[PDB]
Design a binder for these strands. Structure first.
Ligand code: NA
Ligand code: NA
Ligand code: ZN
Ligand code: ZN
Length: 327
DNA sequence: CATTAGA
DNA sequence: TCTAATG
């Protein structure tokens, strides 16, 4: 956790770079299990030889380890860190819409800088355009203070349209987070469940709504169950116009909201932990459901869930307020 | 791990 | 169709 800190750190830098700059999946894939194994290893690694004892730790990796060990550095790192083509790839990637594929690609043409990205808007697709467009606003953390106003709003129109519209702003803000990266609206309605062959318009109405009011400024993407957008608070009595907020709204079968709500909220650890437990209690927990286990190794039979509660009850646990869904 | 663009 | 990108 801190005993094998650097070791894992460099391993990750190292892993990462393979996978981005070079399209070296495997080397990258190497750097990770190692980076993974060595993480756990309950003893302060003092030589590569020691590491080497490890599963996933080859000769190349340890080579590095010792090097890191001796000199509080690594050449491959100093070289990478330094190197432009690489620096540029990691950079550009920051644009919403820009993964490493396109990243390398642009570089190849020489769109290393941001301005580059500008003169080359033709070269960019829709998302990527909006990426570039709210480049700053996107890097920006969302103050709860605003999460509340937004949420506020979202709730009304959700309502103004149909009263059957059940909606939850999940995520960190759900667990009292003082800020968030983007607001996530978990949405379902009674007419939509496991069975009833969809009803695309259910998601659609609402997109149109928030939009009709100006909350939704743009379309990052929009499917029949998932919509990814840009939103923004009515820049008031002016002199202070709101930053464009990243937003996501997802339509759900009502019959499987909660496991999904549970899910969406996290944290990852409460999850994995809540997830670890269900199993003991003789169950199976998923991004949408909870099934009973059957000694035959496994089982099925998706249980009836009427609240974040029921699920707990199931695995018979203490209801943990979202606020304390911390770990 | 699943959903959406897009080519 | 696959292949990228988000989450
Ligand atoms: Na080994
Ligand atoms: Na990106
Ligand atoms: Zn020890
Ligand atoms: Zn989100």
């Amino acid at each position: 956790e801190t005993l094998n800190g650097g070791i894992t750190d460099m391993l990750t830098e190292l892993a990462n770079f393979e996978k981005n700059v070079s399209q070296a999946i495997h080397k990258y894939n190497a750097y990770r299990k190692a980076a993974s194994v060595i993480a756990k290893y309950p003893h302060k690694i003092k030589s590569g030889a020691e590491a080497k004892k490890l599963p996933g730790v080859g000769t190349k990796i340890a080579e590095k380890i010792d090097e890191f060990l001796a000199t509080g550095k690594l050449r491959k790192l100093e070289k990478i860190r330094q190197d432009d083509t690489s620096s540029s790839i990691n950079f550009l990637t920051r644009v919403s819409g820009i993964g490493p594929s396109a990243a390398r690609k642009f570089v190849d043409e020489g769109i290393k800088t941001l301005e580059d990205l500008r003169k080359n808007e033709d070269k960019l697709n829709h998302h990527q355009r909006i990426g570039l467009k709210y480049f700053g606003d996107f890097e920006k953390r969302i103050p709860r203070e605003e999460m509340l106003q937004m949420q506020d709003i979202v709730l009304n129109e959700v309502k103004k349209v149909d009263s059957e519209y059940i909606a939850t702003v999940c995520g960190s803000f759900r667990r009292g987070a003082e800020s968030s990266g983007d607001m996530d609206v978990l949405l379902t309605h009674p007419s939509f469940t496991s069975e009833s062959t969809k009803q695309p318009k259910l998601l659609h109405q609402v997109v149109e709504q928030l939009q009709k009011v100006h909350f939704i400024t743009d379309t990052l993407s929009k499917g029949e169950t998932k919509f990814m957008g840009v939103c923004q608070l009515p820049s008031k009595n002016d002199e202070k116009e709101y930053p464009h907020r990243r937003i996501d709204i997802r339509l759900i079968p009502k019959d499987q909201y909660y496991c999904g709500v549970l899910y969406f909220t996290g944290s990852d650890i409460f999850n994995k932990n809540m997830r670890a437990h269900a199993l003991e209690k003789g169950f199976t927990i998923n991004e949408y459901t909870i099934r009973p286990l059957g000694v035959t190794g496994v089982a099925g039979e998706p249980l009836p869930v009427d609240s974040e509660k029921d699920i707990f009850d199931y695995i018979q646990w203490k209801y943990r307020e979202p606020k304390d869904r911390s770990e």
